Design an enzyme around this catalytic site. Sequence first.
Site, PDB file in Angstrom:
ATOM      1  CB  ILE A  18      -1.066  -0.017   1.141  1.00 18.66           C
ATOM      2  CG1 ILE A  18      -0.433   0.078   2.551  1.00 18.66           C
ATOM      3  CG2 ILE A  18      -1.975  -1.257   1.019  1.00 18.66           C
ATOM      4  CD1 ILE A  18      -1.376   0.579   3.663  1.00 18.66           C
ATOM      5  N   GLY A  19       2.121   1.143   0.351  1.00 13.97           N
ATOM      6  CA  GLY A  19       3.036   2.270   0.399  1.00 13.97           C
ATOM      7  C   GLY A  19       4.357   1.950   1.049  1.00 13.97           C
ATOM      8  CB  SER A  20       7.416   3.320   1.311  1.00 14.71           C
ATOM      9  OG  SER A  20       7.159   4.574   0.702  1.00 14.71           O
ATOM     10  CG  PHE A  23      12.046   0.476   9.228  1.00  9.98           C
ATOM     11  CD1 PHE A  23      11.756  -0.834   8.848  1.00  9.98           C
ATOM     12  CD2 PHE A  23      11.309   1.045  10.261  1.00  9.98           C
ATOM     13  CE1 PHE A  23      10.740  -1.556   9.483  1.00  9.98           C
ATOM     14  CE2 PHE A  23      10.297   0.323  10.896  1.00  9.98           C
ATOM     15  CZ  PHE A  23      10.021  -0.972  10.505  1.00  9.98           C
ATOM     16  N   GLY A  24      10.867   0.857   6.006  1.00  5.09           N
ATOM     17  CA  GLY A  24      10.403  -0.130   5.038  1.00  5.09           C
ATOM     18  C   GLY A  24       9.161   0.161   4.216  1.00  5.09           C
ATOM     19  CB  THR A  25       7.610  -2.007   1.829  1.00  6.34           C
ATOM     20  OG1 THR A  25       8.819  -1.664   1.158  1.00  6.34           O
ATOM     21  CG2 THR A  25       6.485  -2.073   0.836  1.00  6.34           C
ATOM     22  CE  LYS A  38       6.375   2.405   8.646  1.00  5.57           C
ATOM     23  NZ  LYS A  38       6.576   3.594   9.507  1.00  5.57           N
ATOM     24  CG  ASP A 131       5.943  14.758   8.894  1.00  2.08           C
ATOM     25  OD1 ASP A 131       5.703  15.930   8.523  1.00  2.08           O
ATOM     26  OD2 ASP A 131       6.147  13.827   8.102  1.00  2.08           O
TER      27      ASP A 131
HETATM   28  C1  LIG Z   1       2.197  -0.332   9.586  1.00  4.88           C
HETATM   29  C2  LIG Z   1       2.549   0.992  10.302  1.00  4.88           C
HETATM   30  C3  LIG Z   1       3.530   0.981  11.317  1.00  4.88           C
HETATM   31  C4  LIG Z   1       3.832   2.155  12.029  1.00  4.88           C
HETATM   32  C5  LIG Z   1       3.181   3.379  11.734  1.00  4.88           C
HETATM   33  C6  LIG Z   1       3.383   4.663  12.513  1.00  4.88           C
HETATM   34  O1  LIG Z   1       2.426   5.441  12.564  1.00  4.88           O
HETATM   35  N1  LIG Z   1       4.570   4.860  13.159  1.00  4.88           N
HETATM   36  C7  LIG Z   1       4.985   5.970  13.931  1.00  4.88           C
HETATM   37  C8  LIG Z   1       6.298   6.457  13.773  1.00  4.88           C
HETATM   38  C9  LIG Z   1       6.735   7.522  14.574  1.00  4.88           C
HETATM   39  C10 LIG Z   1       5.850   8.096  15.517  1.00  4.88           C
HETATM   40  C11 LIG Z   1       4.514   7.651  15.673  1.00  4.88           C
HETATM   41  C12 LIG Z   1       3.459   8.350  16.594  1.00  4.88           C
HETATM   42  C13 LIG Z   1       1.984   8.215  16.121  1.00  4.88           C
HETATM   43  C14 LIG Z   1       3.512   7.737  18.023  1.00  4.88           C
HETATM   44  C15 LIG Z   1       3.717   9.886  16.674  1.00  4.88           C
HETATM   45  C16 LIG Z   1       4.124   6.563  14.865  1.00  4.88           C
HETATM   46  C17 LIG Z   1       2.249   3.399  10.687  1.00  4.88           C
HETATM   47  C18 LIG Z   1       1.936   2.228   9.985  1.00  4.88           C
HETATM   48  C19 LIG Z   1       0.969   2.411   8.887  1.00  4.88           C
HETATM   49  C20 LIG Z   1      -0.347   1.987   9.047  1.00  4.88           C
HETATM   50  C21 LIG Z   1      -1.234   2.184   7.973  1.00  4.88           C
HETATM   51  N2  LIG Z   1      -2.537   1.778   8.044  1.00  4.88           N
HETATM   52  C22 LIG Z   1      -3.341   1.581   6.816  1.00  4.88           C
HETATM   53  C23 LIG Z   1      -4.795   2.059   7.064  1.00  4.88           C
HETATM   54  O2  LIG Z   1      -5.297   1.449   8.274  1.00  4.88           O
HETATM   55  C24 LIG Z   1      -4.592   1.875   9.457  1.00  4.88           C
HETATM   56  C25 LIG Z   1      -3.107   1.437   9.367  1.00  4.88           C
HETATM   57  N3  LIG Z   1      -0.774   2.787   6.844  1.00  4.88           N
HETATM   58  C26 LIG Z   1       0.507   3.188   6.716  1.00  4.88           C
HETATM   59  N4  LIG Z   1       1.380   2.999   7.732  1.00  4.88           N
END
Ligand SMILES: Cc1ccc(C(=O)Nc2cccc(C(C)(C)C)c2)cc1-c1cc(N2CCOCC2)ncn1
Length: 254
Positions: A18-20, A23-25, A38, A131
């Site tokens: 679905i994206g990146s 560190f990863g995909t 991720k 961010d």
């Molecule tokens: C898989 C994943 C892992 C980790 C993270 C992430 O938010 N890491 C993060 C890093 C630094 C700081 C913080 C905070 C918030 C504490 C400030 C958070 C996001 C994702 C993720 C989920 C996703 N979804 C698709 C739609 O359905 C919901 C899930 N789509 C893309 N990516």
Amino acid sequence: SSDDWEIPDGQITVGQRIGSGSFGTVYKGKWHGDVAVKMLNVTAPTPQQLQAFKNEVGVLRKTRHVNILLFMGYSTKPQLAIVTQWCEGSSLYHHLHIIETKFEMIKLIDIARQTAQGMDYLHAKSIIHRDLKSNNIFLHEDLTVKIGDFGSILWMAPEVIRMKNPYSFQSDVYAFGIVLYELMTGQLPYSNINNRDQIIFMVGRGYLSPDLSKVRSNCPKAMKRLMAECLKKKRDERPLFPQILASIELLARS
Ligand SMILES: Cc1ccc(C(=O)Nc2cccc(C(C)(C)C)c2)cc1-c1cc(N2CCOCC2)ncn1
């Protein structure tokens, strides 16, 4: 005392990419139902990749709140992976600027309140987002706000533009001020300027600021004042999330 965050080996499956992020995909996967995963594409990670993974897990694992994307667990075998809940819906950015969803004022204020609620939770645990933007505000079933870091000069406080440690609770407040602008105008700031360098230079110098006269007719005057307070050029003049949250709750009751 143990949270059992480490997912047992050979349980996670990944499907659609679905994206990146970081560190990863990112994939839509399976682990006790739908999850987002991720994952680092290589089986041998560099010391930096391992450190970035450890830092992200470390922050995520301290969060248990409805307005924060739910961290479910991690794996390092066979690959570094972070697992979160899977949400049907879209980001606030996708709604306002891609499909142009017309939300009622009541829902726009509610989205603002929920974001401020999640941000207040993060700052109480001394977590600075760094961010915050409409792209990082997920609308679960297009109703509940889930803050995450899903993968951004428009949301940058002047001191973040100018630059050693320009990030603070107040630079997150400024980014929230821009989100308030997006909700109340339905637009991104500086849409009449086509030059990124100019935007960066002028915001950093305080020559340019969001055009608050662009806010909708039905936007409460108290919301316009809050937005202006969140967007103050001097970081020490900006309110913190307990005060922001209290102001949104007050104007919502009217
Ligand atoms: C898989 C994943 C892992 C980790 C993270 C992430 O938010 N890491 C993060 C890093 C630094 C700081 C913080 C905070 C918030 C504490 C400030 C958070 C996001 C994702 C993720 C989920 C996703 N979804 C698709 C739609 O359905 C919901 C899930 N789509 C893309 N990516």
